[model samples]
Target: RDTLTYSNCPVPNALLTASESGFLDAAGIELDVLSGQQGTVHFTYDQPAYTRFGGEIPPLLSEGLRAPGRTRLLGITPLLGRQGFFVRDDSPITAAADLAGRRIGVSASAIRILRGQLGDYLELDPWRQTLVALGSWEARALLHTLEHGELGVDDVELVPISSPGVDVPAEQLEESATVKGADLFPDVARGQAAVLASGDVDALYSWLPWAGELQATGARPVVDLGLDERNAYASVWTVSSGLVRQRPGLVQRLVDAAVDAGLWARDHSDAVTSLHAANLGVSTGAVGQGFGADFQQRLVPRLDHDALALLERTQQFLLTNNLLQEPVALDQWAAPEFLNNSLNRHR
Candidate 1:
């Protein structure tokens, strides 16, 4: 079968190497790796079409914020920075209790995870304010609405903070290296949202990496979903069913490679950091020495029990938060054959 191209967020060089080389292949073959969310989203959206074609091929999995019902799972990486709450220091907001009557911008889906986690932790209505239809990358728009007072939570004001900046293409705009881990934080700070959150607003939603940075800034993470072991934000490797059918052993090989990559990362902490920095374009030093080990833990390949549980929780979160138009069965979205094949029978 012909090799298919897969795209993902900047992955470390080692994992990319495994993916490109045929070493991890169950049937022994090579494939291509692409970059960014657009490639992933395009392929994921067309999964059903691929399955109908009936060919064994390798599929592409990617990293970034994901929308339920829009994609299926080959496997999930773990909730890192894709889920959580946040507000700038300049904003007069602090604690979940104070979030009452405040306007918040969240993707209809993310609202559920934030609401459920916060609701479970504190007595607060997640739907307190009008739920605006906004993606994580659209935080800037949320900021504008907050500044105009178009949306406010009682006495609390809301603002926006886009992660990875907007989904704007690189070619359309001038090439520059301004988007950083903390780029969105400044927008909230600019809107005085940080100050509000520090003093006025109750809580902010967010995931890891960024959560760690926020913590450094004195904003405590009310609920660490990554640590919870109950939530799965946007973590998965996906490919169209068409590719899987075309490339007899491609999916199994990819899954094996992923598992191997995870194991390799676990044992080689230094390599993980170097690869993450090189693949994702972040500074190894900036990501922190501890981050390497933590990231490796999130990449474990076992989709057995805990992974399934997290996926179940995520599906539930999507339903409760209006992320899905309607409830979708996990079985319909998950393709476990590849994952199952990767497991050692003894384990």
Candidate 2:
């Protein structure tokens, strides 16, 4: 059997099922899975056979489009939910308007996206609010406290943690330096959560799972981006062009296996969750807690017009934020024929 290495972080259920449920074996490939590392970076540098799962397609597309021939998207699946804003239940904040002048912790991209969604609710530019550069772990920890019923609004301060950059991209070195200043506590994994729990910040913009966990602690879900029809895809499967060119059959087999695994996961959510939890060395409860009841609905692999539109929207976001130097025709980097063919065959 030919060996194929793929990267995953936090271990996606479809990939787990693909390896453990005989999908890969039926596909006639030996799957080597890597976890808990920067799978994208490894795949970008051509270290792995492919990045099989668990990454946003837009940024991956942006990077790939910029480089021309390094990597391409094979397919994408939906997510349970994407972004949302959370605030302490006891806080006076009632809507997006109440968030004005309040301190909010989130990444730069998040600030931009939230602004687009909450612009109608804000009296002033949403960028005027303090945007803290909180890493994912720190943000998750702050919300995780709610899951255990340990977090209280009174236990946390409602002040601002600050960033020096404007919401827009920096046009000058001084401006970029000011933006870089936001990385003040970059090394602090739980800086945002620590500060928020300590009452240092008033609100946080985080993923839906984290927000859901926080609700148990009396944290209210202020806004859910998953409900937003304009939101882009949450994660996708990608492969290097080199792999596609040299091993077309392998690429097709991988896609078929992924789709089969997705279909299997839909019927066996509990089994998939248990397998994912075991592989990640976490509790089955923890895995289930992070996913929603409709999580299985997002496991199917396909590339439709909606997915393309979302990708284009993401490209615009990247361009607006100066993350992309120039526009790229995303269609050039997408190789969805294999997935389309696989889906058609199965149907």
Candidate 3:
């Protein structure tokens, strides 16, 4: 078979590279690496270009592109390190109730997905809180704003930024301030960013692995949700309907390969850090130290029920928040058949 081409987000870029480079080909599959964007997984299969073409094109090589079949879940590589939220340590915002009338900065996407998850737990009136627009995944810029008091931790209300995953122990967090500072500094960049604005918001809602980063920064993580369930899928991998009919087997193989690759990543820490650094454009050596290694382990491959539900809820939240022009149905956007078939066939 010719080399199969695949597309993935930055989080999985390293894993894909390592897999294609022959580190985990023990499963017997050949994959061609294709450069991907930060959020490509969510958009690859659902673009307007595909719909305009009667949905017949596969943007990349995949089984869904070659075969005529209902899409299913394939393999999931938990970019758990991508979970986090930022908040000021010296601020008084320590409870969820403190969020009222605060100014919060978040990516446009967060206003929809994360806000919905948080709404399930808090009372958020979009009008009541200032939603400052910031570029997605740019924590440093937000921090610059904060350090200058242009957005003080105590000024507006709250400014929370998400951070990558972390693995610090809870006991350490409870024991030392410096350790806590070390842990949470990153959380402020990756997860739910409601606390960094002005310290007005009380608490935050975020995913795991990354939440550990918050604990490292000395901020307590009140994990009200676990989004790693198989059914709670987010950041889906989609192909144009055309691809679904053209090369289904290719897509299936890619999915299977991803599953295998993710499994291997879970068992290997060095591989995870190496891949992470490469994809993130940072030093793999920097990914060491307290809790850092532990955080890397959380990025393994797995699926749970919460994945789909989380996506659906995210869709609704986007609509309710006026972030999306129209409501997006969950089934219309996901190719679960691909994942399900891969599971059945591979197992």
Candidate 4:
């Protein structure tokens, strides 16, 4: 099999299903999978063979928008899961409305989430349109000031990092600093849970297994965001443009494998959960509980109207939020023909 370097770090996408199920190998390509904390993998000048979706998008999309020619969209795997506010088991807060005037504790990425709900609540744009890095508490603050949720943006800045595997000094971008009008914790979901127990914050925002974990430890999940197939958030399968120009067919073959895994995983919910769990180094129960039993249903890799529209919305969101350094056209950045070809073959 021809070798191709692949990165799926910190993201447990359907490509994990592809790699674990030998789809990539069977497609006649060997993937050298790379791992990292965030978007640094996509910022290099060296031609990367391929990459799967991950946890956050702005860091990836920001870099992609800055150098549009350097990345190509191969597929989109959108997964809709459970995310919302959680309070203490004994607490009386049972609804989002109950959160009024109550303190909320939000961690790093969730701070960015403020912009999304604020964008929606303020009616400036669709929630997805402003959905950039991640949101909800800061939204309350925005409303309180204008002001609405708990997340804050003052804590974020672009920090640079260089790695031996990477060709250039790239950003190891993350969230931290301060989210005004709410208690901000730079740790993670588990830490926030502890704080909730410690009576430091009235509520903390989290999703899926984290929520489940809190529930298991006697926390009450309030304001369930509820699963929506249309509420699905996608991560782009990115490959360098040079690879698409130099090896378009090779890119197509890889796309076929990724799309094939996505389509197949939809029917094999157990397989999707198990493979993703193993790739993410988490328990299968957590994966199933967090992503839900039928997460496989959302795994279809399509670049159709809704998918591109989501990307366009994201493009506008990043620019509007001043996160994007330069503008790039979705038409040029989206090399979706291979995905279409793959879909046609599968159909």
Candidate 5:
């Protein structure tokens, strides 16, 4: 038998389900689920940890800049639902084209962390978790959209919120802002929520479940084109490069479990949704909307051509935005063989 410590971002993920189910144990691995996802990705994770999955790509890439060749990305899972821009239902803003000169809430703290960077911000609380889970992916989706020049939005102001201020209750969030901000503040979703309610910003950005959940409130989506752009918010699975060089057999087993978890979960949406609300503190309604019925088709981990290109684009975006501490060699950092092997076995 073997042992591994696994951690993932707070959003719902197949690996999170795998960690709790019999998959790893069936693979003859003892999985210690870290309480918080802290101290796990780095080789020097405050404790011993073998692998990580989720919205960790930015930190993982940046850490390599500080400590070269420490990790290898094994797989990518672009989770369910579309990322979206939400406006109050009462607002006259009706389309993505309405964003010009409109202020949108952005998290100053998150930008500082991403541009400079926090392992701690990836904790379990819904506040920080939603920011990490939704903000990271949604921002990337928006950036990709902006790159494509699709939104035609101009003079969109970025209002940076610094505190984890209280969010106006869904019902209480004004029909419109008293007024009306990305760089997501991992610790600042609450602040963004407050500002969104205050009408300081014209729109809000978030990923699936949260997007669906937020929309469940009085908010409306100005745009929900993120789900259509498959490559934008993909999550890459990574492990220590040292581990891959020495214990590829272990990597294979882990990959087997991960891929199988996705395959298994796709068929069991109800259970996955239940697990999400119970485990991540998200509203089950939001989880259902986030994951959606078709999400089952998207959960599989992959390393095909499009996946890698997304990885490269992500790295380039970070580098251009001064997000990574150093640039990564995608050729070297991404190891596709393990995922290929796992997919073959599943086939």
Candidate 6:
């Protein structure tokens, strides 16, 4: 019997099930889950001999690809949906062209992704409109005020929200804003339901799930990175290269358990939502929409050509935006044998 430690930020259903649904037990591994920040710190330091780290693909790539010899991507599950623009149903903006001269809310990293996707649609000048530095939750809140007619386009204020383990360099941030003519600001708030209800900022840049959650409240999907074929694979499960070399069998076992859990989650969406909600002390409905049907379809653990291409696109975006200093060699950054063997065994 062997024990393995795994960590994720905002644990996804697959990881939740693998730890609680007896999948890891069947795989002959004792799994321990750590909070997202704790896991990231531990993984960064290589404190534990064996560790599994899961998070956004771009940031993970920023760390892993940059330190290729230090980390290897084991598997990725698309937990985040299509990152895109969201707007109120009542907005006059019918298409990307309508967003010109309007305030857009998003984080610094989000700006880079959007620029890569919509550079052709809109003049991404930093001084063109305001760039509010709000986290997703805060952005949702600001949208709520607009949706409720409480906040006006001219009345909106910008503020900064602190994010752990996901900050772009000041030079790159300034470059993105200046090049786009975006009036960047520091601000925070939350209330997505109202954002849809009010039609506030003209547009919002975030994941599809937020728009999906607010559809009942009149939120409309404007455009997304996926719509333009600019979407990037959102997350990955990474392990140290040292561990892969020392205990390949253990890696396979963990991947097997994760895939099993993903399969189970797909079929048992209700259970997945219930368990996740209970663990996070949130409403089941919250989990249902956030990690619901759409998320289930993306829960598989595999690293194929498409995944590699997605990573490549993301790397290119990071490099072009000056977020990443150098490019990564996929062959060295991704160790896909464990996922490949696990899939082959199941087939």
Q: Output the number of the TM-score-best candidate.
A: 5
lDDT of 1 by residue, 254-343 (tens): 667666766666676766665554433334553442143366555654456665666555444434444333544556667787777786
Superposition error at 28 for model 6 (Å): 3.9
**Model 3 compared with the native: what TM-score?**
0.47
Off by over 4 Å in 1: 10-17, 20-44, 47-72, 81-155, 160-234, 285-293, 345-347
List the candidates' TM-scores in order.
0.57, 0.67, 0.47, 0.71, 0.72, 0.64
**Candidate 5 similarity to native, TM-score:** 0.72
Ranking by lDDT: 5, 4, 2, 6, 1, 3
Measured by lDDT, the strongest candidate is: 5
Candidate 2 C-alpha error for residue 111, in Å: 7.0
The 0-to-1 C-alpha lDDT of every candidate, in the order given, reads 0.41, 0.52, 0.38, 0.53, 0.57, 0.50
Error of 3 at 226 (Å): 7.4
Give the Cα RMSD of candidate 2: 10.6
lDDT (Cα) of model 4: 0.53
Candidate 2 positional error at 323, Å: 2.0
- After superposition on all C-alphas, the RMSD of every candidate to the true structure, in Å, is 9.9, 10.6, 12.5, 9.1, 8.6, 10.4
Tell me the lDDT of model 3 at 266.
61
